[PDB]
């Protein structure tokens, strides 16, 4: 940057299997949906993709929700 050629390497996320900037990947890792996340209800499933928690919390999870 700043009218210069530094070179920002990219790190292939193992979750979204996509290519990102090593500078972003650091933070993205959090945004990445695929990334597994522990259930807040500690039902048992253990870990489940961030984009999988929503549906799971629907019925999958032990708790009840309508
Ligand atoms: Zn990712
Ligand atoms: Zn659960």
UniProtKB/Swiss-Prot annotation:
Tissues expressing this chain: Expressed in epithelial cells of thymus, dendritic cells of lymph node, and in the basal cell layer of epithelia such as epidermis, nasopharynx, respiratory tract, salivary gland, and esophagus.
Positions of TRAF-type zinc fingers: 27-66
Signals that turn on the gene: Up-regulated by bacterial lipopolysaccharides (LPS) and by single-stranded CpG oligodeoxynucleotide.
UniProt-annotated location(s): Cytoplasm; Nucleus; Cytoplasm, Perinuclear region; Cell junction, Tight junction
PTM (free text): Polyubiquitinated, leading to its proteasomal degradation.
Comment on protein domains: The coiled coil domain mediates homo- and hetero-oligomerization.
Assembly with partners or alone: Homotrimer. Interacts with LTBR/TNFRSF3, NGFR/TNFRSF16, RPS6KB1 and TGFB1I1. Interacts with SMURF1. Interacts (via TRAF domain) with MAP3K4 (via kinase domain). Interacts with NCF1, TICAM1, IRAK1 and TRAF6, and is probably part of a complex containing TRAF4, NCF1, TICAM1, IRAK1 and TRAF6. Interacts (via MATH domain) with GP6 and GP1BB. Interacts with EGFR (via C-terminal region); this interaction promotes the formation of EGFR asymmetric dimers. Interacts with PKM; this interaction promotes PKM kinase activity.
Function description: Adapter protein with E3 ligase activity that is involved in many diverse biological processes including cell proliferation, migration, differentiation, DNA repair, platelet activation or apoptosis. Promotes EGFR-mediated signaling by facilitating the dimerization of EGFR and downstream AKT activation thereby promoting cell proliferation. Ubiquitinates SMURF2 through 'Lys-48'-linked ubiquitin chain leading to SMURF2 degradation through the proteasome and subsequently osteogenic differentiation.
Family statement drawn from the similarity comment of this UniProt entry: Belongs to the TNF receptor-associated factor family. B subfamily.
Name used for this protein in its record: TNF receptor-associated factor 4
Name of the gene encoding the protein in the UniProt record: TRAF4
Portion held of the full protein: 190 to 248 of 470
